[PDB]
Symmetry: C3
Subunit: 114 residues, 3 copies
């Protein structure tokens, strides 16, 4: 899985340990081994949500499987919870694009997962 | 809807008011309320388009519906127009990826739009 | 085609000529003219792969066609090779998301490619 968070929250407001926390919580929620989880946080961004520049986040979660209606609801509760708690971003100012990737469409280690 | 623009144009060349203009015009084009429109501009990027580095933009528009042949032509005219007028980027150095998202695959406010 | 590389490797480690090399190699690999190839490198990112902050890369290749099982294995060998050689990133710390775009869903030059 690959989880990307883009936010206008400044770098100094991203707490130490945030990437590890994301990694651990995602391994668990998705059921995948931690070794396959990639995380990326991009602070200080020029962005708006609903016209407003109050704290917000634009995110994505790509994964080979483990994407679906109920699963995505559960990821959203988790991720929004973490963004609220750690970055002080309101959940209603978060968007997460979920994408179910075909194994043939993910390159890794000189090949793909197909 | 979520609109992202990645560009090599420098931050000081992004005019005041640009995120609001993008929010307004995308609300109108998509028919969605401005409160649901998110915009993100990423200047000063290391990028090339067709081998050169004159001003260019790599963008995406993710929307739940309102994506299709004619609509996307219309979004491209609008968005290329705005990038040309405000960031001085030639339309033939703009790429926009359009993604029609299923409501179950967009997280927001601790759940999805399903 | 559009190729994007997000990496924690620092900007100074990205060699001069890397965008042109990517452009040329992708033109050859995809068979598309270099005028249609866009490349974007984002260094100094806050990211982790497998919980580790050792060098890694999160990438994507969007193309109208020329995406598939065998092709993507080949692109992954090529791309991982280049990231290892030029950025010193281990291939098993690289993810590449491949997306086969419909021509109607790519905006360019005030219209789409449809």
């Amino acid at each position: 899985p690959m989880f990307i968070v883009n936010t206008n929250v400044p770098r100094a407001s991203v707490p130490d340990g945030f990437l590890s926390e994301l990694t651990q919580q995602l391994a668990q929620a998705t059921g995948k081994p931690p070794q396959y989880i990639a995380v990326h946080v991009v602070p200080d961004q020029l962005m708006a949500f609903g016209g407003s520049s109050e704290p917000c986040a634009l995110c994505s979660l790509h994964s080979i499987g483990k994407i679906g209606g109920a699963q995505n609801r559960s990821y959203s509760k988790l991720l929004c919870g973490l963004l609220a708690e750690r970055l002080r971003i309101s959940p209603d100012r978060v968007y997460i694009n979920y994408a179910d990737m075909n194994a043939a469409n993910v390159g890794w280690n000189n090949s793909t997962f197909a």
